[PDB]
RNA sequence: UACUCGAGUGGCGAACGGGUGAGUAACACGUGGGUGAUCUGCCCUGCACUUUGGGAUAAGCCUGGGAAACUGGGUCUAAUACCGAAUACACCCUGCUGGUCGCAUGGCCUGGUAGGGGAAAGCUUUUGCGGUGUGGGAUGGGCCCGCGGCCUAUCAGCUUGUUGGUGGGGUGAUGGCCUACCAAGGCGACGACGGGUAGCCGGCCUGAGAGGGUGACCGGCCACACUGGGACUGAGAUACGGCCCAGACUCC
């Protein structure tokens, strides 16, 4: 009466990444593009929502995406400083 | 602590006389001092602060404890003043005093915090003991006998029993129905200035 | 104003001025009467208003009333100093308190003794 | 020190890293090896200072004077550059 | 180590323990992964309450309990119902509920003759 | 001798617990997430084993040096100390190859296949203790990220490993973390870079509330241990009561 030679692991779901839409703005380094993301919240006092800009920095891998792209984005692991995001497909080339 | 000084000059000071007794004021209608029958500029904290002063010395409670009376009030539900009044009077030492066993609040304390009661069968030398709902205020051996209490067996006909309350037995034990609500409480005094007060 | 006026700008109280820095953050402080005097108060009032200037544990110097009726106190004295504002004297903020290991109790009070100090009599 | 523990941990610690520098020096020195034997160009010398590299960085992994993850990274740029070569 | 634990709460002498599970290289007082009974020793009966099934999560996943709380699961049949040495004893006393105040009040009442 | 045990070897602990808030305006904290980019002693549970051989040394004995701290030598002794080898085919690396998931690198099927490899410790008679590899779990972490929480422009330009990439190195792990080369980018009025202040939070005080102020006890996280720097050991180190160096101070 022997138990298992072997144990499998659990089936932990995998965790879901985050996705953002963006605007690039460089492409001037390689594989890698800067990416606007226009994210709006309301102030905490007085209420107001504020469109607030923010740049992140993305992975393409191959030199597609340039100046006024809009683009879709998953975080990732770093892949190098400030860079913590992937290309995933451009949507509205410009 | 608690005020063991003269309790005339308190009611004569506040008008309103909680135990009787005395010619001084009764013929000449005066605080005390020698400016008694002076003029009185008539303030509404003078107001206030008089009502709040009748309760702690009608009661034998300081103001430091009459505050948290006041804010348990203001916290729970219902009108504070009542509920307030709820509280000073489910007190061991007013709820023997209204049973008429000491017939002043100021003998009732001395006999709660001598030991002679006890409570659900735990002697209690606590007269800010909150009382509560079904409960009985039991006489210890000694005490039955005692001459106070022979005292208030003999003379338990004077004053009326409140409603919320009553005594059972020959040895003088007391039940408690319920808490008293605002036309259970009986006491010459309103509720709404100290509260009043308390929110300045 | 606007509220995206007060998102980019803001509000911001008016500073509330620091005072009895010589304390400095500390409720008394002690100190050397550097000088003993008297001054004269603002015009309304007349008197021979007692003073000293100390230099206190803080490395300032500052003046000091010296309430009460009586003052033993010279130069080179061991002095507790107090917060209070003396109106009639301009430029002073502090009072000198009692109980001082100098400035002994005022003599006679038996009204206000824990205010100058004085030790009840029996 | 003024602890009897600490005063023996002393020469215990110094005796292990006295073993661990012996180990990882004659690791270094098996590597410079190999990648001289790589950079000169010669491969069946390289492949035999491979296998006896890659074995004696999982002895010192099961040793214990390296990670085992440490061990595989070594040894698989050791495979991979005999590979390209 | 993960380890089923009393934490000390209550006043000064009145040591209400809380039976939570951590680690060892926490302190007593300290954060707790999770809550499973309660140990009140001052009842005559002192109180011995717990959860069971979180009980026998955490040594089936392997806490080594401390040796009070060890008694006490030995007392709930937790630590026998885990092992299965005798099934599960079932150990336990309560502190009987003392007579209602209510139930006091009308049996005075009906003294009062 | 072997109950008992100084000292010693060895194991485990010593990284917890305890203290302070100097530093830190930062992923330090809080909160929420990610880790297909990761470690995890002890503990639990499965699988497979625990084979074989050897060389020393502390201690002890005989000495030497030194004022002391301490230390050199000779001789001698054992082990769960140390070291080789065998086996492991679960594991590690590489090559080829299939399916599947896909969130792209890639991950899962302990995929398959070929090659080359990886270990162990014995003790005691008693409610017996252990050891190795491996799978899984649990716990404890690490790293990354969004958002949030001070003053200051009478501090406007800052950056040259700085932004990115390739190949290597390094790590437990991703990554300029490090390096050679390459490209010349990256951050800034939405306040970069500077200056000042300050441990952060749950919470606490006030207040009708919004808010303001605060960060004492208690509890969590961080940081630090005379100052500064550094690694070693180890599962794990800011290593308070550990090591090395330098410095100040105190003492022989």
Known sequence: QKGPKYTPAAEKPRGRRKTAIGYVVSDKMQKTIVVELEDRKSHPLYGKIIRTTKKVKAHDENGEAGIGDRVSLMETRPLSATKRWRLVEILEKA | ARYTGPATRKSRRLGVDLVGGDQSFEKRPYPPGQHGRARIKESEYRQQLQEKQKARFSYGVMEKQFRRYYEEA???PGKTGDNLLRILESRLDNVVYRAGLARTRRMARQLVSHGHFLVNGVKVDIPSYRVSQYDIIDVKEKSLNTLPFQIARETAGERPIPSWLQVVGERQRILVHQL????????????????ELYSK | PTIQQLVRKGRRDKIAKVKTAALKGSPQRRGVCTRVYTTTPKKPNSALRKVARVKLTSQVEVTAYIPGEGHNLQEHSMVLVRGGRVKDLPGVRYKIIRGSLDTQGVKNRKQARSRYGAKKEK | ANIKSQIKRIRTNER????????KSSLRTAIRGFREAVDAGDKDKASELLHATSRKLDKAASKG????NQAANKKSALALALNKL | ???????????????QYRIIVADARTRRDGRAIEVIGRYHPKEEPSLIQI?????QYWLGVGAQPTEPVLALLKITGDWQKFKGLPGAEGTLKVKEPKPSKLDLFNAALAEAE
């Open chain 2, 74 to 76: 203001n916290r729970q």
């Open chain 2, 180 to 195: 008293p609500e605002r036309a259970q409480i009986d006491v010459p005094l309103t509720e709404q200035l100290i509260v």
């Open chain 4, 16 to 23: 292990r890293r006295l073993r661990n520098q012996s180990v």
């Open chain 4, 65 to 68: 004077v390296i990670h085992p």
């Open chain 5, 1 to 15: 180590a993960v380890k089923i634990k009393l934490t000390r709460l209550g006043k000064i002498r009145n040591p």
């Open chain 5, 51 to 55: 959860d069971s099934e979180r009980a």
